[PDB]
């Protein structure tokens, strides 16, 4: 419950990018840079903290436990305004530091920009729902920075960690209990060109140190450590950190490489091993050449040395000849193999053969070849094993299988090998570290061209992966001499860290029948060590050497998959009910990443069945696909020209007829023959069939341990295929049709207060967008309700259920063909829509293309592996798009979500899944040069793409529109679901950040993450739990996209928006009640709910016939308000039943453009509902609340006279004018003080302690003792609050009434004082207008709110007495 007070300051530190403690060159410092950073101070800024060395510009580290507060006492000592902005849920509008359009008063604008040489005070509060609190890591990490200028105030060196932790861990010194260290690492890129002192800089630093000049950080050996890896850069960078020789554990995944994208952070743990130096490598092929790393030296502290189990429990020893005698060679390589079916013209007759005498016959291509003999006298296989081809030398490592790597360099250059996540033994280095010790304890890394060598490491059962990880981990191994040059030469393999899966010393696996190796390498011959043996030596046209030319240079860029370019001419055939296991990885001198769409099936991923994998550069991943379909399919990547339409691997999934191995070309080894016949899978040894590795007779010691001991103790067609699926079908009628569409919705009267913003692009653009119609015969559409206001460009949400069956009658209506393609779903090739080779005549090709003005009816089947796993969640998002040309279609607008929810989620609202809010958002940047309707020579510049506005034709949209995206409205403290998707703009990884909010995952039931990184292809379902009302801001915190256009001001409102908007009270005067048609004589100024008299309903003139037309009454508000319901009522004089039954509602913010859609609205199908009898107050609710100035209702069907009385239910503007609790009872009577509890001597007592609005009983107001202009009513709010508005009233006693008429307001500070309320733009006090009638209310507003907890009300001029019932509308500030 403590308060983490913190003193910070910002000063201009002259900072070179390296440290040096000398003199001669340390006065004349040749290189330097101006910088502004964060430096912590002792209280009152007298002294200054030590500022440990390893943190160069990384500012002070803030921290807290769940429950405490933070009072950062900022003080800007630099010469430009600055601020501080953390990440999470805490900040109210005066402690967030960001200055955007949120409609706040000049009081809460001070935190946004602190002038140079001025103080402030930042206060936060770590709630119970912003911390981990469960199986999350012991405690998380967030980055705090400057929000005044997200680009000029970061590269100037303004950043710092914010390390919030879990209740019960953090000590007083700011260090965890069990952990022995608290390290923080800032991988960053400080572009000094976009900085305060704009000088060019090629800086790829870490903490402010370049090329690895950071001083060595060191710890002891065999202890537990805690990491905190930040990362931040203006541009969209990527940091694939790698810990050499060690293993980490983030997110319960025993990973050996942590990936961070810009403006993100994470925490992780590891236990250090024996001593010896190490390196923190950055795997990204760009952060390598640049040069950035650290050093991990390990000391030897004389405290304790552990002694644990060495042998594998004395039974699973497995000590035999299962070592590996690998080597290197330079054999001939055919990228397209010898005489394939699908020949290629480029690589054959221009790059291998002597046809037109290009090179010769030979490629000098190195590869790790595997000899099975020790003496290196024979390869293991010269031909192939019927299904491998180039399945690499498989290195399967498990507990003590005598894994010895014998190595015989037989090449013409120094080479080596280097695995991943494999600690070395000091007998042989197995790494190219600098300090290779002397001849005594030697550690050799390279091998000269002709030598031999011997490595040594056999893993034991001491680093088994977590159960949440995959079955068989996969890791590469390559030549560590020069990575980019050696891998290009062709040195790479797979190192498989499986589990205790050995049944025999041959090493077969279980739980995965068939396995296939697939890596995505890209051999850049221009960076190979045999280009000279390609053009220089072996050649016949070197006459004028082809080089430095776009043709020749890019022609030898051979991006392949397992080397072989053309095709696996044997498509990967399979059986049914099998569980194939795949191993994925990728290398190549290229920064970008890949995503591998898996057409047709899906694979388990942490018990979720995802269908797209984003594999990162130079680190692998393993999946498991199941055979539950029949037909041909694909495995494709889709990023851009060289890889999208190229990387494909066709593979069957079939059997015919029994199991397909009686007369066919897939004879496996069961062999599905007569059951009485012999083959593999039936190898009965002496004892019995496969049980284990045979050992002692019984060896009673057959207990499996826990790992580490628990120690410390007309084409109107329909669907046709739904015959055997036997489904609970659900029908939809989509279409596709052109439309005009311009992203900029703020100039569409959203936030266009300006009048001179010159449009820098085209006015609008012609897209093609999905729609939703009502039946098989079209032209009867379904308009987008209030729910679908934020969809923007996405089609209709196609919802479903587990084990359902979907029928979709797509019907193209555009100029070129289109189609559909689901994801993670089940269908047939005649229900796929993808364009490639099939297994039938153009009968299965009926869906592959939907010609214009026609229609096809797909049949999709959502099975068990297509539903939302991870019981912590409810619905599972997905996507569908026009997959005829998947790159130019999605960039045209044809994209939509496809949700799948569990069994039970659907209400009697057409049975479409409902019962929990959900916003769907597709973060994507739209390119107009990749669409179909891209008129090339636009009217700005025809030569280049608007050379006058270069690259102005790419729009960073947030789900359609830009800067506006209206429709995002949530309550306070309500669980809303979010389906964030990203498949359009691939190479741009996005990180989603809501202001003042903390997201959440499920499955493992707990994950906060602060902000989430959207991987291009992932489908993420999260939960929000909105925090506080006001105008917040949704964006992506990559500073060069937040300013580019990805920022939407979503809205949190109050959680009690149920207050009358003035109809019954009297706020809404009768000067603004209109009517088109009328009912007799009953003036509409008398349409007030619960109004008595003789005429109490709506009319102006006489009707004489009213049953068919739809008259209307129009209420005005004079300001934009919220409306969350309506309170209907019936009228009569003595004998008119006269009630309305059905009635719809319109609304408008301009009185001209009306949106009549809340009657037959979203939750409704095509109707609304109303009253049931005479005066019995009946009310309805607008589930998505509406917000408009004018509102107009129209009754259709009533009882013999369509009358009504209406009363509205809304809230306010800033969005926190909630009842402070007077009438609610949330305030007790001990927060009200005044002068006299005025009593008579022949009657009652006049209580200034019952000033409740609309509370009834005895004298329930404050008639002061004696009349004078010097009484008052003082309210002690018990904590400083923002007092927004006031409502006065009048009182009486059964007789002549009297009431206040005009009052002034004296208020206080935190303490006891009283000061007048001088009008902002005046020189004297402000005067208010009190009541005018007895019971009617009057609302008075404050131009700036009164931020206090003392407030006095001065009755200045009144009517014959002081008397009022009072209610303040305030806000719970902190």
Swiss-Prot record:
Gene Ontology CC entries for this record: COPII-coated ER to Golgi transport vesicle; endoplasmic reticulum lumen; endoplasmic reticulum-Golgi intermediate compartment membrane; extracellular region; extracellular space; extracellular vesicle; membrane; plasma membrane
Site feature (Cleavage) residues: 306-307, 506-507, 679-680, 709-710, 723-724
Binding sites annotated in the UniProt record for Cu cation: 993, 995
Residue stretches making up the F5/8 type A domain: 2-301, 320-656, 728-1057
Positions annotated with a glycan in the UniProt record: 23, 27, 211, 269, 354, 432, 440, 526, 713, 853, 1160, 1359
Residues modified as Sulfotyrosine: 665, 696, 698, 743
Sequence ranges assigned to domain F5/8 type C in this UniProt record: 1057-1211, 1216-1371
Modified residues (Phosphothreonine): 612
Top-level taxon in the UniProt lineage: Eukaryota
Documented activity regulation: Inhibited by SERPINA5.
UniProt keyword annotation of Secreted present: yes
Gene Ontology terms for molecular function: copper ion binding
Effect of residue 359 to T: In THPH2; Liverpool; mutant protein is expressed with an additional carbohydrate chain
Xref: SUPFAM superfamilies: Cupredoxins, Galactose-binding domain-like
Post-translational modification: Thrombin activates factor V proteolytically to the active cofactor, factor Va (formation of a heavy chain at the N-terminus and a light chain at the C-terminus). Sulfation is required for efficient thrombin cleavage and activation and for full procoagulant activity.
Keywords recorded for this protein, A-Z: Blood coagulation, Calcium, Copper, Disease variant, Disulfide bond, Glycoprotein, Hemostasis, Metal-binding, Phosphoprotein, Repeat, Secreted, Signal, Sulfation, Thrombophilia, Zymogen
Keyword Phosphoprotein attached: yes
Compartments in which it is found: Secreted
Tissue: Plasma.
Subunit architecture: Factor Va, the activated form of factor V, is composed of a heavy chain and a light chain, non-covalently bound. The interaction between the two chains is calcium-dependent. Forms heterodimer with SERPINA5.
Protein name: Coagulation factor V
Species annotation: Homo sapiens (Human)
Highest classification ranks of the organism: Eukaryota, Metazoa, Chordata, Craniata, Vertebrata
């Amino acid at each position: 419950a403590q308060l983490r007070q913190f003193y910070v300051a910002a000063q201009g530190i002259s900072w070179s990018y390296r440290p040096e403690p000398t003199n001669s060159s340390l006065n004349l410092s040749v290189t330097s840079f101006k910088k502004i950073v964060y430096r912590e101070y002792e209280p009152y800024f007298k002294k200054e903290k030590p500022q440990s060395t390893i943190s160069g510009l990384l500012g002070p580290t803030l921290y807290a436990e769940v429950g405490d507060i933070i009072k950062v006492h900022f003080k800007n000592k630099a010469d430009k305004p600055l601020s501080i902005h953390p990440q999470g849920i805490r900040y109210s509008k005066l402690s967030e530091g960001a200055s955007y359009l949120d409609h706040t008063f000049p009081a809460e604008k001070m935190d946004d920009a602190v002038a140079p040489g001025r103080e402030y005070t930042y206060e936060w509060s770590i709630s119970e729902d912003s911390g981990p609190t469960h199986d999350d890591p012991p405690c998380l990490t967030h980055i705090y920075y400057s929000h005044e200028n997200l680009i000029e105030d970061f590269n100037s060196g303004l950043i710092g960690p914010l390390l919030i932790c879990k209740k019960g861990t953090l000590t007083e010194g700011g260090t965890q209990k069990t952990f022995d260290k608290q390290i923080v690492l800032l991988f960053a890129v400080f572009d000094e060109s976009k900085s305060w002192s704009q000088s060019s800089s090629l800086m790829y630093t870490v903490n402010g140190y370049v090329n690895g000049t950071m001083p060595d950080i060191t710890v002891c050996a065999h202890d537990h450590i805690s990491w905190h890896l930040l990362g931040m850069s203006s541009g969209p960078e990527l940091f694939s950190i790698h810990f050499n020789g060690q293993v980490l554990e983030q997110n319960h995944h025993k990973v050996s490489a942590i990936t961070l994208v810009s403006a993100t952070s994470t925490t992780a743990n590891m236990t250090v091993g024996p001593e010896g130096k190490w390196i923190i490598s950055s795997l990204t092929p760009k952060h390598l050449q640049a040069g950035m790393q650290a050093y991990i030296d390990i000391k030897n502290c004389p405290k304790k040395t552990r002694n644990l189990k060495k042998i594998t429990r004395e039974q699973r020893r497995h000590m035999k000849r299962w070592e590996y005698f690998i080597a290197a060679e330079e054999v001939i390589w055919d990228y397209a193999p010898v005489i394939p079916a699908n020949m290629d013209k480029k690589y054959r007759s221009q790059h291998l053969d002597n046809f037109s005498n290009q090179i010769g016959k030979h490629y000098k291509k190195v590869m790790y070849t595997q000899y099975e003999d020790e003496s290196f006298t024979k390869h293991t296989v010269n031909p192939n094993m019927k299904e491998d081809g180039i399945l690499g030398p498989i290195i399967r490592a498990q507990v003590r299988d005598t894994l010895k790597i014998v190595f015989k360099n037989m090449a013409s250059r120094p080479y080596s090998i280097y695995p991943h996540g494999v600690t070395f033994s000091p007998y042989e280095d197995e790494v190219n570290s600098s300090f290779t010790s002397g001849r005594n304890n030697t550690m050799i890394r390279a091998v000269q061209p002709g030598e031999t060598y011997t490595y040594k490491w056999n893993i034991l059962e001491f680093d088994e992966p977590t159960e949440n990880d995959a079955q068989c981990l996969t890791r590469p191994y390559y030549s560590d001499v020069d990575i980019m040059r050696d891998i290009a030469s062709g040195l790479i393999g797979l190192l498989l860290i499986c589990k205790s899966r050995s049944l025999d010393r041959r090493g077969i696996q279980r739980a995965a029948d068939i396995e296939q190796q697939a890596v995505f390498a890209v051999f850049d011959e221009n960076k190979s060590w045999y280009l000279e043996d390609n053009i220089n030596k072996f050649c016949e046209n070197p006459d004028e050497v082809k080089r430095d030319d776009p043709k020749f240079y890019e022609s030898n860029i051979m991006s392949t998959i397992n080397g072989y370019v053309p095709e696996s001419i044997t498509t990967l055939g399979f059986c049914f009910d099998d569980t194939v296991q795949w191993h994925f990885c990728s290398v190549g001198t290229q920064n970008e990443i890949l995503t591998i769409h898996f057409t047709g099936h899906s694979f388990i991923y942490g018990k979720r069945h995802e269908d797209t994998l984003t594999l990162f550069p130079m680190r692998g991943e393993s999946v498991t696909v199941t055979m539950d379909n029949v037909g041909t399919w694909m495995l494709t990547s889709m990023n851009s020209s060289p890889r999208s339409k190229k990387l494909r691997l066709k593979f069957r999934d079939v059997k015919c007829i029994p199991d397909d191995d009686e007369d066919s070309y897939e004879i496996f080894e069961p062999p599905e023959s007569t059951v009485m016949a012999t083959r593999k899978m039936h190898d009965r040894l002496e004892p019995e069939d496969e049980e284990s590795d045979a050992d002692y007779d019984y060896q009673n010691r057959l207990a499996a341990a826990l790992g580490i001991r628990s120690f410390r103790n007309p084409d109107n067609i329909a669907a046709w295929y739904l015959r055997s699926n036997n489904g609970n079908r659900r029908n939809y009628y989509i279409a596709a049709e052109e439309i005009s569409w311009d992203y900029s919705e703020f100039v569409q009267r959203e936030t266009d207060i300006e009048d001179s913003d010159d449009i820098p692009e085209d006015t609008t653009y012609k897209k093609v967008v999905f729609r939703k119609y009502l039946d098989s015969t079209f032209t009867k559409r379904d308009p987008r309700g209030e729910y679908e206001e934020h969809l923007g460009i996405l089609g209709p949400i196609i919802r479903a259920e587990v084990d359902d069956v979907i029928q979709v009658r797509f019907k193209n209506l555009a100029s070129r063909p289109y189609s559909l393609h689901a994801h993670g779903l089940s269908y047939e090739k005649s229900s796929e829509g993808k364009t490639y080779e099939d297994d039938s005549p153009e009968w299965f090709k009926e869906d592959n293309a939907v010609q214009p003005n026609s229609s096809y009816t797909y049949v999709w089947h959502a099975t068990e592996r297509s539903g939302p796993e991870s019981p912590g969640s409810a619905c599972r998002a997905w996507a569908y798009y026009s997959a005829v040309n998947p790159e130019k279609d999605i960039h045209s607008g044809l994209i939509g979500p496809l949700l799948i929810c569990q069994k039970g989620i659907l209400h009697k609202d057409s049975n479409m899944p409902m019962d929990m809010r959900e916003f769907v958002l597709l973060f994507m940047t739209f390119d107009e040069k990749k669409s179909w309707y891209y008129e090339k020579k636009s009217r700005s510049s025809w030569r280049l793409t608007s050379s006058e506005m270069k690259k102005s034709h790419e729009f960073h949209a947030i789900n359609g529109m830009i800067y506006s995206l209206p429709g995002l409205k949530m309550y306070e403290q309500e669980w809303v679901r979010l389906h964030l998707l990203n498949i359009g703009g691939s190479q741009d990884i996005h990180v989603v950040h809501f202001h003042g909010q903390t997201l959440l995952e499920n499955g493992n039931k707990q994950h906060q993450l602060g902000v989430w990184p959207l991987l291009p292809g992932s489908f993420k379902t999260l939960e929000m739990k909105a925090s506080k009302p006001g105008w917040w801001l949704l964006n992506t915190e990559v500073g060069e996209n937040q300013r580019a256009g990805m920022q939407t001001p979503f809205l949190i409102m109050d959680r009690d928006c149920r207050m009358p908007m003035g109809l019954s009270t009297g706020i809404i005067s009768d000067s603004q009640i209109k009517a088109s048609e009328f009912l007799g004589y009953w003036e509409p100024r008398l349409a007030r709910l619960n109004n008595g008299g003789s005429y109490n309903a709506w009319s102006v003139e006489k009707l004489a016939a009213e049953f068919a037309s739809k008259p209307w009454i129009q209420v005005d508000m004079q300001k934009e308000v919220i409306i969350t319901g309506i309170q209907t009522q019936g009228a009569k004089h003595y004998l008119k039943s006269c009630y309305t039954t059905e009635f719809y509602v319109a609304y408008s913010s301009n009185q001209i453009n009306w949106q009549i859609f809340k009657g037959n609205s979203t939750r409704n199908v095509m109707y609304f509902n109303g009253n049931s009898d005479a005066s019995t107050i009946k009310e309805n609710q607008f589930d998505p609340p509406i917000v408009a100035r004018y509102i107009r209702i129209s009754p259709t069907r009533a009882y013999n006279r369509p009358t009504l009385r209406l009363e509205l239910q809304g809230c306010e503007v800033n969005g926190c004018s909630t009842p402070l609790g007077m009438e609610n009872g949330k305030i007790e009577n001990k927060q009200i003080t005044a002068s006299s509890f005025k009593k008579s001597w022949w009657g009652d007592y006049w209580e200034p302690f019952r000033a409740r609005l609309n509370a009834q009983g005895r004298v329930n107001a404050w008639q002061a003792k004696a009349n004078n202009n010097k009484q008052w009513l003082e309210i002690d709010l018990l904590k400083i609050k923002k007092i927004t508005a006031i409502i006065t009233q009048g009182c009486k006693s059964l007789s002549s009434e009297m009431y206040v008429k005009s009052y002034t307001i004296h208020y206080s500070e935190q303490g006891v004082e009283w000061k007048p309320y001088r009008l902002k733009s005046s020189m004297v006090d402000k005067i208010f207008e009190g009541n005018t009638n007895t019971k009617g209310h009057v609302k008075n507003f404050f131009n700036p709110p009164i931020i206090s907890r003392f407030i006095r009300v001065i009755p200045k001029t009144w009517n014959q007495s002081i008397a009022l019932r009072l209610e303040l509308f305030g806000c719970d500030i902190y």
